[PDB]
Write a protein that binds this ligand. Structure first.
Ligand SMILES: Nc1nc2c(ncn2[C@H]2C[C@H](O)[C@@H](COP(=O)(O)NP(=O)(O)OP(=O)(O)O)O2)c(=O)[nH]1
Ligand SMILES: [K+]
Ligand SMILES: [Mn+2]
Ligand SMILES: [Mn+2]
Length: 328
DNA sequence: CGGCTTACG
DNA sequence: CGTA
DNA sequence: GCCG
């Protein structure tokens, strides 16, 4: 088992679901307390279990696995022996974890904001609604739409959304394309949002595209919120039809020049941990700097041209993983 | 011990 | 600060 | 929290 998540296939569904869930609770709780290193180790240990070919049934099977030390091994041991881990259950029922989880779920609220509200004594969404002076416009939108945004987006929802985005994109710039990215591209059947990547085959024609797209979607009455109600990324709330009604859905739109499209597709397809691990691998093992725009050799001071995700894995000396196997 | 992904709004 |  |  390799140490980096980008060195092994990780399928969406696997054989250690309960074990990985528990470790991810501890990861999430570590992030709520600002311990990014502990969050990373618990996420990586969870991801190792997702990559295993069969269930862990005995503690000895953790021998030699990367990112399993005393703490993660004890969590697994207790789950194997008792079906519950006391530390995990204590986190689950703690007021701090439940409130930080509730608050950071709000669109526009991160750990720092949630933690300040927590320290001020706030605990529920209604507490926030009673103090609208504490809220940015973005947070007001996230709070108002919180119930709809807590409902999973379905794969059936995605196709109808892509068609309306393509229609607006086609009027904004004929020939521009829309690619589904994010978790749905990795094979997920539900999601917290829908992620799209937009480009145009003629380099440079995509400049200034996203404002044109957003103002067309807004004129059609489809945008419940966006930040610009020049930019290349838009995190918005869409109005999506339902039976006899509609529901709010988060949609992320990103524009990239076609020269950068493989890097942007790779970055925005995720998973988040897969990309962190891939960029760490690139820098630490290959001495190359990877981001959503390109791959930089800092010694030659040169960028790698890529025509495909396959190109990028080859540049990094990694076996290619299709999106479905990037579910780290 | 240092390190832990990276850039745009 | 937020977002991905 | 774990790796190198
Ligand atoms: N490098 C990097 N990439 C990131 C980061 N955050 C997001 N991405 C990339 C990788 C992500 O795949 C992509 C957008 O995915 P999401 O919508 O944030 N989540 P997903 O679609 O997996 O699941 P669901 O929506 O159902 O919760 O942006 C980050 O901090 N860093
Ligand atoms: K949030
Ligand atoms: Mn997504
Ligand atoms: Mn997204």
């Amino acid at each position: 088992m390799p140490a980096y998540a980008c060195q092994r296939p990780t399928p969406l569904t696997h054989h250690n679901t309960g074990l990985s869930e528990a470790l991810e609770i501890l990861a999430e709780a570590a992030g709520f307390e600002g311990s990014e290193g502990r969050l990373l180790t618990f996420c990586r240990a969870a991801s190792v279990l997702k990559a295993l070919p069969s269930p862990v049934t005995t503690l000895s099977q953790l021998q030699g696995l990367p990112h399993f030390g005393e703490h993660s091994s004890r969590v697994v041991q207790e789950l194997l022996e008792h079906g519950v881990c006391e530390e995990v259950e204590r986190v689950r029922r703690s007021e701090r974890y439940q409130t930080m989880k509730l608050f950071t779920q709000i669109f526009g609220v991160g750990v720092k904001t949630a933690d300040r509200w927590y320290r001020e004594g706030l605990r529920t969404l209604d507490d926030l609604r009673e103090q609208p002076q504490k809220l940015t416009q973005q947070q007001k939108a996230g709070l108002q739409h919180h119930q709809d945004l807590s409902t999973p987006v379905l794969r059936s929802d995605v196709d109808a959304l892509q068609q309306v985005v393509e229609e607006a994109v086609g009027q904004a710039l004929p020939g521009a394309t829309v690619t589904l990215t994010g978790g749905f591209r990795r094979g997920k059947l539900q999601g917290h949002d829908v992620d799209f990547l937009i480009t145009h085959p003629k380099e440079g024609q995509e400049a200034g595209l996203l404002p044109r797209v957003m103002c067309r979607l807004q004129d059609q009455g489809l945008i419940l919120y966006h930040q610009h109600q020049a930019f290349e990324r838009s995190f918005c709330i869409f109005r999506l039809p339902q039976p006899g009604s509609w529901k709010a859905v988060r949609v992320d739109l990103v524009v990239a020049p076609v020269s950068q499209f493989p890097f942007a597709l790779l970055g925005w397809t995720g998973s988040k941990l897969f990309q962190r691990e891939l960029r760490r691998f690139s820098r630490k093992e290959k001495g190359l700097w990877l981001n959503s725009h390109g791959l930089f050799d800092p010694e030659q001071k040169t960028f790698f041209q890529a025509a495909s995700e396959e190109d990028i894995f080859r540049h990094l000396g990694l076996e290619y993983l299709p999106p479905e196997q990037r579910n780290a």
